[PDB]
């Protein structure tokens, strides 16, 4: 409902550049794997097709069941799904930071 | 050949600056499939009134 | 009022292909459709 919408990108030039390269050439298979996924996050936006509900009742005799249906489809909007690892990639982020400090001490002596 | 080493540890250095962004990605990589897969639920929802209609 | 069997092998015609086509014999097409959803799936961390 809110956070990352498709707009959301990180500046992949700085990234390019801090990666040497085929030595990290893992960054040339995660660049595309998140590009598949922005690809998912191509389709399906947040708003859904909208249905004009007054000409199937016009159409249909008895519009008593699309009244039914549209109250039914107002009452179930399901939010979104909550957040799986987010705590494991919180502790890879103190771990990185752990080793960010390391390597930055090792490169200064 | 000081110099240049110097050069390569400024560039290591870098890198690890920019682990953090590559963390965010990763948490963007996975709030974007999250979000793929609800709205196309919402999309199917959606195309299940307009089928019963 | 009156109708032959033409037109009644005519409606059940019509109906069991409806039937057929938006799938009513796995569910109730005149009552709202019971959604049976399940948790997204999220990579794992690393590769």
Do not use: C
Not at chain 1, 10 to 26: L, R
Not at chain 1, 33 to 56: C, F, M, T, V
């Amino acid at each position: 409902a809110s956070k990352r919408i498709a707009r959301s990108s990180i500046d992949w030039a700085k990234m390019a550049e801090s990666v040497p390269e085929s030595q990290k050439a893992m960054y040339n298979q995660f660049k595309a794997k998140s590009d598949g996924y922005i690809r998912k996050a191509l389709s399906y936006p947040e708003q859904p097709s909208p249905i004009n509900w007054e000409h199937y009742r016009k159409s249909l005799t008895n519009p008593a069941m699309v009244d039914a249906f549209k109250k039914q489809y107002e009452a179930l909007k399901v939010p979104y799904p909550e957040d799986k690892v987010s705590s494991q990639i919180d502790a890879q982020e103190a771990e990185a930071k752990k080793e960010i400090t390391k390597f930055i001490q090792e490169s200064r002596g | 050949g000081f110099e240049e080493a110097i050069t390569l540890e400024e560039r290591a250095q870098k890198s690890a600056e920019a682990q953090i962004m590559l963390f965010q990605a990763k948490r963007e990589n996975v709030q974007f499939q999250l979000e793929a897969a609800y709205r196309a639920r919402l999309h199917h929802v959606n195309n299940e009134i307009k089928k019963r209609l | 009022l009156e109708a032959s069997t033409e037109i009644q092998r005519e409606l059940d015609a019509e109906l069991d292909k409806l039937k057929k086509m938006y799938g009513g014999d796995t569910a109730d097409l005149s009552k709202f459709p019971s959604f049976h959803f399940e948790d997204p799936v999220v990579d794992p961390i690393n590769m």
